[PDB]
Amino acid sequence: MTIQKVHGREILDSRGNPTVEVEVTTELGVFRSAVPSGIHEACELRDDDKRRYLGKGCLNAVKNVNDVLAPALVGKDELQQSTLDKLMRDLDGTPNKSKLGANAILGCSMAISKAAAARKGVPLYRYLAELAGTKEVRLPVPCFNVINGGKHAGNALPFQEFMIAPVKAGSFNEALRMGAEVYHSLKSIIKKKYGQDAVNVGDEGGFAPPITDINEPLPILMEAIEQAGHKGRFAICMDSAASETYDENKKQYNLATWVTAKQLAETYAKWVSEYPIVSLEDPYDQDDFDGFAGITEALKGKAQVVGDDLTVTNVSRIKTAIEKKACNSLLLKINQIGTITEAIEASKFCMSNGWSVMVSHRSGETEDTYIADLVVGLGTGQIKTGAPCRGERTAKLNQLLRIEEELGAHAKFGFPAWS
Ligand SMILES: [Mg+2]
Hints:
Layout: E1 5-12, E2 18-26, E3 29-34, H1 59-73, H2 81-92, H3 102-120, H4 124-132, E4 141-142, E5 144-148, E6 161-165, H5 172-194, H6 217-228, E7 235-239, E8 253-254, E9 258-259, H7 261-274, E10 277-281, H8 289-298, E11 304-307, H9 315-323, E12 329-332, H10 334-337, H11 340-352, E13 356-360, H12 370-378, E14 382-384, H13 391-407
Parallel strand pairs: 4-14, 7-10, 10-11, 11-12, 12-13, 13-14
Antiparallel strand pairs: 1-2, 2-3, 5-6, 6-7, 8-9
Helix pairs in contact: 1-2, 1-3, 2-3, 3-4, 4-12, 5-6, 12-13
The structure holds magnesium ion.
């Protein structure tokens, strides 16, 4: 009835860096989970041996799975998520998981929950829904990354992510096709205006064209949506990652074109007014609680404001945020917090304070599909997991089709407020 084996191994992620994979064995099978990788987050433990993988090795985190966590988990009842997640946190002993590593622990937490789902005779998403007390599961609207700027692209583009989202789709099956078609349509446009080389892809599968006009990107997307055949069925999500353009010293942002926060809101207003933008992620710096707060009010009813760097999937950052009424949407990254029980706790807490929850990949991913099940089981209606391109992104989109098939034609889709 109990856990029989727990093992860790180092594997490669989608950009060629090591990460941690864990298998939990029971009489029911071998349950396998891998950890993704992207100040206030749970510690990701690396070996910093410069002779292996440029310091990025995961031997120590693996050793910690096999030598500390495993002997502690063998002989236990994998059904007990909360209890085992606490035992693992108490084994590390530190508030940020910096002795054993969040990458050692999360892998255990995930795989345990999968063994537990088998034990209960239900698919993983049904099991997660129960642990989360989700009243209705649903398939999420996929927010696909299609155009890159900021620290990723050598573009004149300053902001990190433009995303398209098939909010008027009727199912996930249709959403994925819609997203795909606009993607090919986008590539086509971009290749017309910039050339073959310009449509090669970033880490998350979208494009990094050499655009030069801060106003040329949003309309490219509108053009790709029409050419795809889906005029008026898509919305737009941004991720500014504003921290990356900011001076703690100059108190301003460098869009060198330096501008105020007051002034930078003028830009966000002109875009949400013009374009069907429904979500704005990290519009200001990760400590600009007041800059966040104002734009959130300004955009009440038009677009959600989503904390990523702001909230770092961290309860005490989230409570800070709720006090200052700084955002109303949490980016949810399981490996920033480190256990499934906490991640679920964080989701319940934001939702119960009136926030949405966008479940998210990391820029370093694996063929793992856990988050497809999580986002369904949490019922958030929103996921960000890549362009419809690159296997570490598409494995998630595919898992979502599988889940929707299993749910049957009754199965619910998307984010109501965007539908
Ligand atoms: Mg971000």
